[PDB]
């Protein structure tokens, strides 16, 4: 049921790396004003990895408070420990989050059965809608369509963020499932095509700097308007490319800085976008009319 | 500079997941007895990602207590947060660890420069020998030989665990380093080859079940006795392959259970060795004279 443009929102930071609450606040308000359908708080793009548990809670709480029930909020609550994922997802629920996005355990490479048992355990432990999140390139594991299909049987497992960018496989996944659970794109550059094939939305990086354009692209692709989905995407297709010239969220945070929306803060081991890409990005933002 | 067989020790668990302190004590004792040259406490093989911070500290504490200065203890203290890694590495230092092993930040994909700044920051914050650890298949990031050479200039960065299993690449690493830091194998199958090439040791998974054998293999290869290192390694070569039928430490823990040394405990998302693999493992263990 949650659909359209879902922004994986950055966690604005002060020069020293402290969370910049006033920028965070303005961003959320802007996304709501601009058309953004919902926000994933503290996901990969929001630097889940470098924020303390206390900061995860603080950030989730502020985004919910500022949203004021106008759009649904998803809390990023993934962990590579089943026990810890349970704790983070429970905390998200108690905070009133509408759903939780859970990346597959990264680094420790669990088996498919383990991924199955991991998710099942969380779903039975916390009574909240859970969205799976597969991004093999970052985690070391690949949650198969088959395993996702098995998980779709659990009532509170309501979707999956497929960041593979493998359109054929995403379509295969969509078809293998029925409205059993939703499928969200996690790859901005092929998102439009995924939604045209039935995905319910796009958990976007690009929606961070072009919330309305992406808002529109999703509405149109979900309505199966291929031609208008193609020409509305072409206008921002370049953005989809440069926002990953270095690992996300490095580029998108610098973009947001060139837009005057946030400061340069960014936490190690991540680093400020290398000088090498700042100008080509400034030009990409101009070419798209962002600035 | 630590040299030889360095066991990446498992952390024994009771059926319900609780750390089996008694078995751990017995294993540490056994390793010292059998010829193990060093122990890595709470590394990947020790399920560092599913142990609480307190259990982390406790495992290091116990291993150090039992070892009683007989052999150097390395503490696994890697994190994908620079702040977090410094905290864990200071802790290890204050606990009496001889060095710390830090895997490259996983999941969040820092740049090469981010990797350099991450490790540099930790080196300067904690006066303790640090060993880098590159295992691209688990982390989603590959610390290049160039970035390694850079880091080797730093006084207390004393070594690198190269888990690529790419010997020619390791040859190039050993050569480019000009001795500035040690190189350790993180791939049991090719460890004897990397050591014959100049590696100072093997942070081994196999040493968990064949410590006497891996200890001689290491000493002989480090001495550059190619014929004896090959024939000694040939006797345990099938183990290096079987111990990875599923993701480590899933197989080595079960092997150790078949040996009657530990219980079946393992924490989700990890799972006990799949049935189909238990017998073949038992046989390899029998052929190697372990069982
Ligand atoms: N630590 C080893 C274990 C994985 C087991 C593969 N089946 C690695 O990085 O590859």
Q: What are phi and psi of A19, to 5 degrees?
A: -60, 130
* Shortest-distance atom of ligand 1 to CA B138: 9
Which residue's CA is the nearest one to ligand 1's atom 8? B248
Q: Which two tokens stand for residue B187?
A: 């791939």
Please give the distance of CA B237 from its chain centroid, rounded to a whole number: 18
Which residue in chain B is spatially nearest to A110 when comparing CA positions?
A: B270
Q: Which two tokens stand for residue B223?
A: 């001495």
**Does residue A233 contact residue A239 with C-beta atoms inside 8 Å?**
no
Q: How many angstroms separate the CA atoms of A246 and A227, rounded?
A: 31
Residue B241: enclosing H or E segment and its boundaries? helix B237-242
**Does residue B258 contact residue B234 with C-beta atoms inside 8 Å?**
no
DSSP code string of chain A = ---EEEEE----B-TTS-B-HHHHHHHHHHHHHHT--EEEESSTTTTGGGS-HHHHHHHHHHHHHHHTTSS-EEEE---SSHHHHHHHHHHHHHTT-SEEEEEPPPSS---HHHHHHHHHHHHHHS-S-EEEEE-HHHHS----HHHHHHHTTSTTEEEEEE-S--HHHHHHHHHHS-TTSEEEE--HHHHHHHHHTT--EEEESGGGT-HHHHHHHHHHHHTT-HHHHHHHHHTTHHHHHHTTSSSTTHHHHHHHHHTTSS-S---TTS-PPPHHHHHHHHHHHHHTT--
Q: Which two tokens stand for residue B91?
A: 């802790």
CB contact under 8 Å between A140 and B115, yes or no, is no
Nearest to A81 among B50, B80, B271 (CB): B50
Beta carbons within 8 Å of B287's beta carbon, 6+ residues apart: B238
How far apart are the CA of B260 and the nearest CA of chain A, in angstroms?
Answer: 24
Give the residue, out of B138, B251, B276, with the most ligand 1 atoms within 8 A of its beta carbon, to mutate for a pocket test. Answer: B138
**Does residue A30 contact residue A78 with C-beta atoms inside 8 Å?**
no
For the CA atoms of B133, B135, B140, B141, the dihedral, rounded to the nearest 10 degrees, stands at 50
Question: Which DSSP category does B19 fall into?
Answer: B
Which residue in chain B is spatially nearest to A107 when comparing CA positions?
A: B138
> Chain B partners of A249 at a C-beta cutoff of 8 Å?
none
Q: Which two tokens stand for residue A67?
A: 């949203």
CA of B136 to the centre of ligand 1 (A): 11
- DSSP three-state, residue B134: strand
Please give the distance of CA B233 from its chain centroid, rounded to a whole number: 18
Q: Which two tokens stand for residue A208?
A: 């961070």
**B230 a known binding residue?**
no
A106, HSE (Cβ side, Cα atoms, 13 Å): 28
Q: How many angstroms separate the CA atoms of B160 and B100, rounded?
A: 11
Range of the domain at B114: 1-291
List beta partners, residue B184: B161, B201
How far apart are the CA of A87 and the nearest CA of chain B, in angstroms?
Answer: 12
Instruction: Measure CA of the first residue to CA of the last residue in chain B; give whole Å.
Output: 34
Locate tokens 């700044």: which residue? B117
Residue B242: enclosing H or E segment and its boundaries? helix B237-242
Q: Which two tokens stand for residue B41?
A: 């406490």
> Which of B8, B7, B40, B11 shows the shortest CA–CA distance to B24?
B11
Q: Which two tokens stand for residue A133?
A: 């999140």
**Does residue A210 contact residue A236 with C-beta atoms inside 8 Å?**
yes
Locate tokens 């970035």: which residue? B147
Q: What are phi and psi of B138, to 5 degrees?
A: -100, -35
> Which of A8, A23, A16, A29 shows the shortest CA–CA distance to A266?
A16
Q: How many angstroms separate the CA atoms of B84 and B122, rounded?
A: 10
Entry resolution in angstroms?
2.3
Q: How many angstroms separate the CA atoms of A20 and B244, rounded?
A: 45
Which residue in chain A is spatially nearest to B118 when comparing CA positions?
A: A269
Q: How many angstroms separate the CA atoms of B280 and B291, rounded?
A: 13
> Among the options A161, A180, A230, A277, which is catalytic?
A161
**Does residue A221 contact residue A192 with C-beta atoms inside 8 Å?**
yes
Residue B263: left if φ>0, alpha if ψ -120 to 50, beta else—which one?
beta
- DSSP three-state, residue B158: strand
Instruction: Measure CA of the first residue to CA of the last residue in chain A; give whole Å.
Output: 34
Residues with CB under 6 A from ligand 1: A 109; B 44, 135, 137-138, 163, 244, 246-248
| Count of domains observed in chain A | 1
After which residues does chain B have a break in its backbone, defined as C to next N over 2.5 Å?
none
- DSSP three-state, residue B52: coil
List beta partners, residue B40: B8, B74
List beta partners, residue A134: A162
Q: Please state whether beta strands A4-8 and B182-185 pair in parallel, antiparallel, or not at all (unpaired).
A: unpaired
**Does residue B184 contact residue B203 with C-beta atoms inside 8 Å?**
yes
CB contact under 8 Å between A50 and B83, yes or no, is yes
How far apart are the CA of A155 and the nearest CA of chain B, in angstroms?
Answer: 21
Nearest to B114 among A82, A114, A271 (CB): A271
- Per the annotation, the verdict on B161 as an active-site residue is yes
**Does residue A105 contact residue A88 with C-beta atoms inside 8 Å?**
no
Q: Which two tokens stand for residue B122?
A: 């930790």
> Which of A232, A233, A286, A231 shows the shortest CA–CA distance to A255?
A286
Beta strands in chain B (DSSP E): 4-8, 38-41, 73-76, 99-103, 130-134, 157-162, 182-185, 201-204
Beta carbons within 8 Å of B173's beta carbon, 6+ residues apart: B145, B148, B160, B162, B183
Biggest CA pair distance of chain B = 49
Q: Which two tokens stand for residue A281?
A: 């990005």
Q: Which two tokens stand for residue A163?
A: 């960041």
Nearest to A111 among B118, B139, B246 (CB): B246
Beta carbons within 8 Å of B94's beta carbon, 6+ residues apart: none
Cβ of A70: how many Cβ atoms within 10 Å?
Answer: 12
Question: Which DSSP category does B206 fall into?
Answer: G
CATH number at residue B58: 3.20.20.70
Long-range contacts from B163-169, C-beta under 8 angstroms, 24+ separation: B163/B133, B163/B134, B163/B135, B163/B136, B163/B187, B164/B134, B164/B135, B164/B136, B165/B189, B165/B190, B167/B193, B167/B194, B167/B197, B169/B145
Q: From the DSSP assignment, how many helices (H) and strands (E) are in chain B?
A: 13, 8
Q: Please state whether beta strands A182-185 and B157-162 pair in parallel, antiparallel, or not at all (unpaired).
A: unpaired
CB contact under 8 Å between A107 and B139, yes or no, is yes
> Chain A partners of B137 at a C-beta cutoff of 8 Å?
140
> Which of A43, A44, A54 shows the shortest CA–CA distance to A19?
A54
Question: Which DSSP category does B157 fall into?
Answer: E
Locate tokens 């609450």: which residue? A21
Q: How many angstroms separate the CA atoms of A217 and B42, rounded?
A: 47
**Does residue B120 contact residue B86 with C-beta atoms inside 8 Å?**
no
- Give A36: exposed, middle or buried? Use CB within 10 Å, 0-12, 13-18, 19+: buried
Q: How many angstroms separate the CA atoms of B117 and B115, rounded?
A: 5
CB contact under 8 Å between B111 and A82, yes or no, is no
Q: Which two tokens stand for residue B283?
A: 């046989």
List beta partners, residue A130: A100, A157
Binding residues of A, as ranges, are 44-45, 104, 133, 138, 161, 203, 248
Which residue in chain A is spatially nearest to B116 when comparing CA positions?
A: A269
Beta carbons within 8 Å of B11's beta carbon, 6+ residues apart: B19, B24, B42, B46, B47, B51, B55, B59
Nearest to B140 among A114, A118, A140 (CB): A140
Q: Please state whether beta strands B201-204 and A201-204 pair in parallel, antiparallel, or not at all (unpaired).
A: unpaired
- DSSP three-state, residue B137: helix
């Amino acid at each position: 049921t949650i659909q359209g443009s879902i922004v994986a929102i950055v966690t604005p930071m002060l020069k020293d790396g402290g969370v910049d609450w006033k920028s965070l606040e303005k961003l959320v308000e802007w996304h709501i004003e601009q058309g953004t359908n919902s926000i994933v708080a503290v996901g990969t793009t929001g630097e889940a990895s470098t924020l303390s548990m206390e900061e995860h809670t603080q950030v989730i709480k502020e985004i919910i408070r500022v949203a004021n029930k106008r759009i649904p909020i998803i809390a990023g609550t993934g962990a590579n420990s089943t026990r810890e994922a349970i704790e983070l997802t429970k905390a998200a629920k108690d905070l009133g989050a509408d759903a939780a996005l859970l990346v597959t355990p990264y680094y420790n490479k669990p088996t498919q059965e383990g991924l199955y048992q991991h998710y099942k355990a969380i779903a039975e432990a916390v009574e909240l809608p859970l969205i799976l999140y597969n991004v093999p390139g970052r985690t070391g594991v690949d949650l198969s369509n088959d395993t996702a299909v098995r998980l779709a049987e659990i009532p509170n497992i309501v979707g999956i963020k497929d960041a593979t960018g493998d359109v054929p496989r995403g379509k295969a996944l969509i078809d293998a499932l029925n409205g059993k659970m939703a499928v969200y794109s996690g790859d901005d550059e092929t998102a439009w095509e995924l939604m045209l094939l039935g995905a319910d939305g796009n958990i976007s990086v690009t929606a961070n700097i072009a919330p309305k354009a992406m808002s529109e692209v999703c509405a149109v692709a979900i309505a199966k308007d291929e031609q208008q989905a193609k020409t509305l995407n072409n206008k921002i297709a370049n953005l989809h490319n440069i926002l990953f010239c270095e690992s996300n969220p490095i580029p998108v945070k610098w973009a947001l800085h060139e837009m005057g929306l946030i400061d340069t803060g960014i936490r190690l081991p991540l680093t400020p976008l290398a000088e090498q890409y700042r100008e080509p990005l400034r030009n990409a933002l101009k070419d798209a009319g962002i600035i």
